[PDB]
């Protein structure tokens, strides 16, 4: 995350780190949506153009974390993967349409002060909150700039941007399963996600019921925190039939 700030303790309890084994490194962000299911971006697991193709056994899930590098004994919990499900119409070839994956954990994780699931929006939540100008929140252990890395989880709050502006910021085809967010050049505040933050959550706090909903998944941008560019997020509500199918089936 570029131009954010250090998270508070327990500020993002659904935050997950995807952690590569052999070699030990940050793979991606992700989020906790129940005691056995974790949500991330498909391209954190499968991306042929960068020769990324991780299988269950390649990674661990680290939940409860704050420090990027430390093993947070008695706080964090570390989970193994049962199975990965990638959206069947994930579009890695063109534009990262449907950039979404789910991971079933081998054992349920216990909830704690540090470990707690986020809500997924229903239709009404999305219609109420996914509006130009409304801010959500992005968190991750990713790069502090485009071209270093944080001691602790980073947070930034960023406004949802109008679709035409999103579209006019890039030559890539923007679909209805994406939204973008970020400040404009004349706005005089900054912030973005960056390398290592993909997969993590864009959340909003409902003013109706005071619950946090994960409206987006950190997907891609052209660089990090570049004037005139924005972050692209996977639209969680538009993919929720898939999500619900996977969890009800498996």
């Amino acid at each position: 995350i570029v131009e954010g700030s250090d998270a508070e303790i327990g500020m993002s309890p659904w935050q997950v780190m995807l952690f590569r084994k052999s070699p030990q490194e940050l793979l991606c962000g992700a989020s906790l949506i129940s005691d056995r299911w974790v949500l991330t971006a498909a391209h954190c697991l499968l991306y042929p153009p960068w020769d990324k193709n991780f299988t269950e056994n390649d990674l661990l899930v680290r939940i409860g974390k704050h420090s990027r590098t430390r093993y947070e004994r008695n706080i964090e919990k570390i989970s193994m993967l049962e199975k990965i499900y990638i959206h069947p119409r994930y579009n890695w070839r063109e534009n990262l349409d449907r950039d979404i994956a789910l991971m079933k954990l081998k054992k349920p994780v216990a909830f704690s002060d540090y470990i707690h699931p986020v809500c997924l929006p229903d239709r009404e939540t999305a219609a109420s909150l996914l509006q130009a100008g409304y801010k959500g929140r992005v968190t991750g252990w990713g790069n502090l700039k485009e071209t270093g890395q944080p001691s602790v989880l980073q947070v930034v709050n960023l406004p949802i941007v109008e679709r035409p502006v999103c579209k006019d910021s890039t030559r890539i085809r923007i679909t209805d399963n994406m939204f973008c967010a970020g400040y404009k050049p004349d706005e005089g505040k900054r912030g973005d996600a960056c390398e290592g933050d993909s997969g993590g959550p864009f959340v909003m706090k409902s003013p109706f019921n005071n619950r946090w909903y994960q409206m987006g998944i950190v997907s891609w941008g052209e660089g990090c925190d570049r004037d005139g560019k924005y972050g692209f997020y996977t639209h969680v509500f538009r993919l929720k039939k898939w999500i619900q199918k996977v969890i009800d089936q498996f």
Binding site: F19, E25, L26, T69, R70, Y71, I78
Partner: peptide, 11 residues
């Protein structure tokens, strides 16, 4: 390895 060692039971 920048990251601190994970207990062997997870690896």
């Amino acid at each position: 390895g920048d990251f601190e060692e994970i207990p062997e039971e997870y690896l």
